[PDB]
Amino acid sequence: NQPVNQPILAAAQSLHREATKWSSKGNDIIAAAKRMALLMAEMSRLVRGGSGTKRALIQCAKDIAKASDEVTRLAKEVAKQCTDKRIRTNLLQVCERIPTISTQLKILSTVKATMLGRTNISDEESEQATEMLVHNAQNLMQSVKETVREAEAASIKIRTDAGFTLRWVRKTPWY
Amino acid sequence: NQPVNQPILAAAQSLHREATKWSSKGNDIIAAAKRMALLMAEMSRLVRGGSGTKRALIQCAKDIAKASDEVTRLAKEVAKQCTDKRIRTNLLQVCERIPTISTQLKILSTVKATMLGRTNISDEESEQATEMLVHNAQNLMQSVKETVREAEAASIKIRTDAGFTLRWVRKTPWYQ
């Protein structure tokens, strides 16, 4: 019943679609990407919530950042074990933007929360803080979605036996 | 001397170079662009400075935004007056980005000022908030510089007299 932002919800669903195609068992990215898409959704309802929940919004941002740090760490570990050179480059490119996007997400979530509780803001500041947060959330969801697909491609051409192992197994049907 | 954020100062100097090509008398847009470059240079000192300056950082961004609203407002009349194709559209597009950029400057400057020197914010959040402010300042300086250039280009062609008074007089370099 609570008002929910369309962009936050849609960006979260975008990542959710790609992450639920795979099993989290043996997959660091699936466990984190799944966890991120869930938080992002929480994020959707929180930005429309009131001041008391402002501290809630802040933590969510913090949690999204923590989960995105795990995604990047592991994505780099996969790339540092990939034989194919061109693909690895794209995986390292797309994942290395996550720290920047995530930290920007924490900044913009703190500004939105502070503004809501605080009184007298120009709708200009309010609406611009919202727009900045949503654009950032969309960029983060897209970056993680792109990272998950590349981390799979880099598991096809492994550098050596043992080393880093990352399990890619589609979702078993209920039966 | 005092530590300064070099990319903010460079963006300020970029606008300063363009604005000081002309006289401020009879051209408020020019007066506002010069004022903006001066405030932006002060901003590079403040952003690199300590906590005694948090209020100053917020007020300087407020002043930069106020001066950019005057730039935007004036560019508009001129933009409408010009009969030109291939330049008038560009002028309008360029000066309609400015209020967004300067409202974003106010947001990002408020974040930096409260937060700096606290010990409650990581060095990552601190550096990232600085980089966001830097990028925004560069974008603003570039937008106003492009607005100055095009506002002069548009003034060449006016439909009729007594519509708005605009004066474009070059200043002579020491090498007169």
Report what the structure shows.
2 copies of one chain form a homodimer. Chain A has 175 residues and is an all-alpha fold. Chain A has a single domain (1-175), classed as Alpha-catenin/vinculin-like (Four Helix Bundle (Hemerythrin (Met), subunit A), Up-down Bundle). Helices cover 69% and strands 0% of the residues of chain A. The first copy, chain A, has helices at residues 6-19, 28-46, 54-79, 85-95, 98-117, 123-153. In chain A, helix 5 runs antiparallel to helix 6 (123-153). The longest helix of chain A has 31 residues, at 123-153. Chain A is elongated. The two termini of chain A are 34 Å apart.
Labels describing this entry:
homodimer, mainly alpha, Four Helix Bundle (Hemerythrin (Met), subunit A), 6 helices, elongated, Vinculin (chain B)
Task: Provide a compact summary of the structure.
Chain A: Residues 1-175 are annotated as: C-terminal tail. The structure is a homodimer. Chain A has 175 residues and is mainly α.
CATH top level class name of chain A: Mainly Alpha
CATH architecture of chain A: Up-down Bundle
Fraction of residues in H or I helices of chain A: 55-70%
Number of strands of chain A: 0
Assembly context of the chains:
homodimer
| Largest interchain contact | A-B, 14 and 13 residues
Radius of gyration of chain A from CA coordinates: 18 Å
Structural class of chain A: mainly alpha
Overall, the morphology of chain A is elongated
Number of domain modules of chain A: 1
Order of helices and strands of chain A: HHHHHH
PDB class: cell adhesion
Keywords: 5-Helix bundle, cytoskelatal protein, lipids, cell adhesion, structural protein
Assembly: dimeric
Entry title: Human metavinculin (residues 959-1134) in complex with PIP2
